[PDB]
Design a protein around this ligand. Sequence first.
Ligand SMILES: Nc1ncnc2c1ncn2[C@@H]1O[C@H](COP(=O)(O)OP(=O)(O)OP(=O)(O)O)[C@@H](O)[C@H]1O
Ligand SMILES: Nc1ncnc2c1ncn2[C@@H]1O[C@H](COP(=O)(O)OP(=O)(O)OP(=O)(O)O)[C@@H](O)[C@H]1O
Lengths: 433, 416, 124, 129
Amino acid sequence: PGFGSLQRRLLQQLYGTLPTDEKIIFTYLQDCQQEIDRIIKQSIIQKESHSVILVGPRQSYKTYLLDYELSLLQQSYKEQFITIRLNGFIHSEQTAINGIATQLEQQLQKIHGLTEVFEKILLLLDSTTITVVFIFDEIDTFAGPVRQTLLYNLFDMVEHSRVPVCIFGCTTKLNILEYLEKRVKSRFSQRVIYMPQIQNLDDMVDAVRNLLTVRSEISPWVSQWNETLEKELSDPRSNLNRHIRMNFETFRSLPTLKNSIIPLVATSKNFGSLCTAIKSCSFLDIYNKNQLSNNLTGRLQSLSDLELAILISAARVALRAKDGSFNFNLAYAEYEKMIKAINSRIPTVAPIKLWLKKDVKNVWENLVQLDFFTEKSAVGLRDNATAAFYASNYQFQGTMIPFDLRSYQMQIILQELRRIIPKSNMYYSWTQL
Amino acid sequence: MNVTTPEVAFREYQTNCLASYISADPDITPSNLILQGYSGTGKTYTLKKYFNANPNLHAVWLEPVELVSWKPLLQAIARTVQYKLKTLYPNIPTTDYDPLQVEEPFLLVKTLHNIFVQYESLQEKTCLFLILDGFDSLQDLDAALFNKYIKLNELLPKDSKINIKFIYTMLETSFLQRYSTHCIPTVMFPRYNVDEVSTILVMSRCGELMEDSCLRKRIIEEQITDCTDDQFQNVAANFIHLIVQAFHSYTGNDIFALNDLIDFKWPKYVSRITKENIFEPLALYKSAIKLFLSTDDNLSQTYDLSIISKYLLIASYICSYLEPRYDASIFSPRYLQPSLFAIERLLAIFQAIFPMKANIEVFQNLSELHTLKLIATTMNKNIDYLSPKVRWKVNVPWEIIKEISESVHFNISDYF
Amino acid sequence: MIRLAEAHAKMKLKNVVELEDVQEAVRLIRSAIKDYATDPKTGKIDMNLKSVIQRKLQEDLSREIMNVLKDQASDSMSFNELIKQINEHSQDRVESSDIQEALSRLQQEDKVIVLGEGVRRSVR
Amino acid sequence: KALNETLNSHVITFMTRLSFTAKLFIYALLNLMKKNGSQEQELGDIVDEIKLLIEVNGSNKFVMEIAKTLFQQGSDNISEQLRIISWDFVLNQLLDAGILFKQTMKNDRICCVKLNISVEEAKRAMNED
Ligand SMILES: Nc1ncnc2c1ncn2[C@@H]1O[C@H](COP(=O)(O)OP(=O)(O)OP(=O)(O)O)[C@@H](O)[C@H]1O
Ligand SMILES: Nc1ncnc2c1ncn2[C@@H]1O[C@H](COP(=O)(O)OP(=O)(O)OP(=O)(O)O)[C@@H](O)[C@H]1O
């Protein structure tokens, strides 16, 4: 019964929504964390004006630091900062202004209980007085070839506002200083901060230690949990340590490892079960193979005999072709030819079905949907709504020409088939030309 | 916090994964969750099966399949969330917001914020599992759309007592691989094995077929005396195994096509049932053989055409598959798509092969063929035949041209 | 290959042909045709004949040498003992020069002690 | 100090701090750029060029372990994969950081990939590994 308390405590720490007094800052992040915190405190406590962009890939803990700093400062300066949040994906170049207008009023309501828009905002702040905080995710989206009036005004307000003004930007591009136009680039304070990447296995081991340890006596098994965690992080031959090393070698986004670990803690039913699972550490293999179950090999292992034979025949035509193109007629011709060959190599007796061309249509439809084939020049999923509009307006020839003559290209080359297809398969001998 | 788990067969790992990431406390659930699998994998089945065992979870169901574009998808979220909140907690005084006012995602965020502020008086923080089935099945779709719903709830104030916890279901793998860096919790559905498909069909569609009117007739007609429900179950079960083993290499491993084949062939198989056919299903197989020898998914002298039309369609095929080099020698690439040609070639070849001059009936038959779509043109809208830019091609396969040549006694087989 | 195998032993003036003759004959054919410098899918010649993969191999080899040195219940070991314990224990034997290079790098970083050719000793 | 941070670029150090798979990807792409004299390489080229680079050194013992990591993620229950583990992850991550350029095509083999950064700094980053 009491195991549930610790099991929930572990998950609550894992998701990261801890109280500011209980929250964790990883060691390798602390330098940039203090660099950000100094600017934030200068802008809020000491009424300075600044503009900063944070750099780093997605899931690099970039916004977590800002959230931690604001949650810290809300304890002592609750009445002295206003936060404005804008996201590049949701807010367009039009909807940003309305978002700012609504959020300013929303903050002011709980506080009290564009040539002139920004100036009137400043005048309202002056007449009601508080430091205005701007947070931007996906700066590159705002910094596109579309006119950058929003950031142009925001960075101009830094050294001209009668009210303290601070701007934080978030993006993953490294060429940010070329994304921003020369007009905007000039006005920006250019104190670019690059998030510290994990660069040693010691960094990741310490991050795991910080993340999974329990610092308070929530449960009587907290001492056992911390000790077991440190033991498994200590012995180099631990299964968990091996998996952590593999993660570090493969990809260095820590939240991926966090999300991988979450099911292990969540599924645990008892402390003994938790200890056995974390020692064996076998369920990460199951998770990883399920991550791989809908890959090319996973889809290929599920096909039927006739589907596999038609796939092999299509691959052979693609291989013989100069451009790799093929169609239904050639595929069925090769299927008939290989069935004839297989029958011929079986001696005739003195006194295998070639499926009808109509029945093979269902097999063709199955394979086209499972993405083993693709249309000659299929762009696939378009990038943006305007591209989707122009795509849906147009009528492609490949959708009009008959089912038997649509041109396709192959995704699994015959060599990959020979790697994957078991040799016990009857059609395996045709995986060679 | 603890959530009970239904025993969904062949989805045990995914049921455990949905026991994870889904709980009463919004501090123990993620902002986004994706379940992925191709069609006929059980995701829509399994998700509803899991939610049907834990009513306390407040789930909202929507289907982009019906909602053609993104505007209906946005509006339905607000509408259904508002209605569900009224259904769950009615006593709080609230004011309605029109779901048709949601023209932008920012307006969706605004409306959600306003609604949650109206419920702020709630004692406890609670989850709101908005569910979208087949996100990639949306017909007006683009790559940039999904990020807007990935990074949504962080614009909401975290002080709100109601927290939205999105759940998505997806079909394609090429959609997931554009969003792998986000490390979104993902639960995967692989295609079932044959041993799984057969048992799924036996468990699901057995009793429904077992008591249909068609058997309600035949049981009395054959005056079966010792029949019991177990015999019914076994006789019905044998049908699914026979159809699966007969048409597995044709359908593949899809439940839908097997169900449709069973639906079509079940009355005919029942028709062959006699007094001696039950308790020996081998005889049932040995009498309904022709059901298992053809797919019978077909919807049903195939073309009855005028002689002028027949020779025009012969000449058009000759134009479409003979290289232009040979028109000056023969008369004086089957697997490939047909090449284009001009009417000037068609008229000359037709005049050279018919056993006719330029009376209106020839052109009338040609236009009839175009209206029949036995011959295609290079346009889609505002057909302008007389414009010189239009070109012609054959839309008929060789297997029909051969029969036409036989019916008109022509020898296309010797020109290639 | 077989004719060159007999020709090598004839130079050796030995009554039989053995592994060294065969392996050298195989190598000579490999070197003559210049196989490893030829791309296996285009037949083109690589004009260049330390990669990152080699760097990883030496990193892991040095770390495994450290692990073996600190895991065994002996403060010191010989290079022949190390070869018997690791190199010849599993999989085809690899050339011992790489092990020597790794331990020399560790010694230059003062992670291992090499008091002599016949002995290798743990860290100070 | 202010002048140094204005002039110095984080690209090279970030590349040197990339994971092993990303460095291997960039190394294989540079190798194809040398062997073909081209600016862009299809994933059909790179996916098996990585296999070639693994196989050329395949006579070494730890090449077996690195192959087990790259193609079966070190587990016996996983069969051979046509992509190295996290191929998609690193492929997107290089596109996310602006290092890499990819053209839209729903075919996972004929899709073309091109470096956005300069060649010489990539060579320098590979040299420092
Ligand atoms: N309020 C929060 N509480 C707990 N964890 C959080 C919070 N906000 C973010 N995180 C953590 O942040 C990690 C991902 O990084 P983060 O959210 O800071 O990046 P981001 O802002 O999405 O990045 P980018 O804009 O560069 O794409 C996740 O592992 C998540 O747990
Ligand atoms: N484990 C199972 N046991 C029994 N029946 C199952 C099982 N899994 C799936 N099914 C069957 O699968 C059928 C198809 O529903 P399913 O959930 O598979 O659709 P789907 O893959 O979400 O479809 P779509 O992509 O068209 O929305 C259901 O009618 C259900 O009976």
